[PDB]
Amino acid sequence: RRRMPYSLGTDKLEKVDPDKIKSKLSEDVERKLETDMRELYDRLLPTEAIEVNRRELVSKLERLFNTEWPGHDIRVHLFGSSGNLLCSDDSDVDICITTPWRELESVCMIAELLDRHGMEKVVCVSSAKVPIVKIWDPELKLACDMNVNNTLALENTRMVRTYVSIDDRVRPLAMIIKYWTRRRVVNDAAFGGTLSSYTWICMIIAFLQLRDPPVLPALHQQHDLKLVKQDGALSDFADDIPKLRGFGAKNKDSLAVLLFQFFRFYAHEFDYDKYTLSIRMGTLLTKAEKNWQYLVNNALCVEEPFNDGRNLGNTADETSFRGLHMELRRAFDLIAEGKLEECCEQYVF
Ligand SMILES: Nc1ccn([C@@H]2O[C@H](COP(=O)(O)CP(=O)(O)OP(=O)(O)O)[C@@H](O)[C@H]2O)c(=O)n1
Ligand SMILES: [Ca+2]
């Protein structure tokens, strides 16, 4: 399922003279793009029935696990887009199973139990860095990936949820960019050699942190607004939502202007060879100061904010990155003229 064929080669795209790159939408284009984005967002928002089903899946799993293995305080939690305000009705369900009982981290035992209780397409990856069980629930009609005790993923999901809660523009902008990535088939870091949705979300956040004035702060740096978590530890990132809300309100750019600027930033402004995007810091880092010029698959460097050693761009080789950059050029060209529908056309192999 390789998205970017090896024929593309690996050449970097040349930087275009900044004076020759459109920097502003015309009023007519902005007005129509705003309306078209708002219509698309309304269609992408989730519906009650499916949001309820996501919760029902959590409860069903928790009951099954505590009946099979009682006395181990097994709890089940949504994460990913089901927990960060960025899901649509067709989004998969990311689930984290927490327990002090480390025996449960051998996930083949979970697969066997779920197969016994009517889940379908039950498969597992026991030797991955994060072992997972995948299922299809035929009653709730949900595809689910679950892990055991990956509490970092609960926290980075909660971080994304906090960013979404800080400024009204984040949810529609991110939901629309995510839709673009699905239609263009550039959000498949396993099969396709492109980037995970989480990676794209971090890129959206990093872009918004770099607006003038910024739309989003650097939550990991706002120490005085960190609250204590349910587990009793101080949060790694600022999370006092009432005190953070409004941070970006001084930036008055519309959703249309922000979508145009997102594609302009990634298509033309950002120097991929030199810099690492860091939502932990809210400022650009250099690859060189992280020794990231040596990483395999380092054409795009997007630092995971909880593990400064993980490049979220590491699933894109140089060929795939070339194709991704070309897709960003294409999107910039089209959004510049308000062509949202064409920008989001389904890619066909
Ligand atoms: N490198 C990574 C990749 C993923 N994760 C964790 O997995 C979740 C789902 O990834 P995801 O890519 O499915 C993001 P989501 O908003 O759910 O997208 P979707 O609606 O298109 O399904 C993220 O929210 C992170 O908690 C991580 O910790 N490190
Ligand atoms: Ca997901």
Numbering used by the authors: 248 to 596
Report text from the authors:
Template-independent terminal ribonucleotide transferases (TENTs) catalyze the addition of nucleotide monophosphates to the 3′-end of RNA molecules regulating their fate. TENTs include poly(U) polymerases (PUPs) with a subgroup of 3′ CUCU-tagging enzymes, such as CutA in Aspergillus nidulans. CutA preferentially incorporates cytosines, processively polymerizes only adenosines and does not incorporate or extend guanosines. Here, we report structures of the catalytic core of T. terrestris CutA (TtCutA) in the apo form and its complexes with a non-hydrolyzable CTP analog and A3 RNA.
We first obtained crystals of CutA in complex with a non-hydrolyzable CTP analogue (CMPCPP). The structure was solved by molecular replacement using the apo structure and refined to 1.45 Å resolution with an Rfree of 18.1%. In the CutA-CMPCPP structure, one Ca2+ ion was observed, coordinated by side chains of both aspartates, and non-bridging oxygens of all three phosphates of the incoming nucleotide. It corresponds to metal ion B in the canonical two-metal ion mechanism of polymerases. However, it was not visible in our electron density maps and most likely absent because of the chemical modification of CMPCPP. The contacts that stabilize the incoming nucleotide in the CutA-CMPCPP structure include binding of the γ phosphate by Lys425, Ser328 and Ser444. The side chain of Tyr445 is located between the ribose ring and base of the incoming nucleotide, stabilizing it through van der Waals interactions. The 2′-OH group of the nucleotide forms a network of hydrogen bonds with Asn403 and Thr404 side chains, thus ensuring preference for incoming ribonucleotides over deoxyribonucleotides. The strongest contact may be the hydrogen bond between the O2 carbonyl of the base and side chain of Asn403. Moreover, Arg557 is located 3.3 Å from 4-NH2 of the cytosine, potentially forming a weak polar interaction.
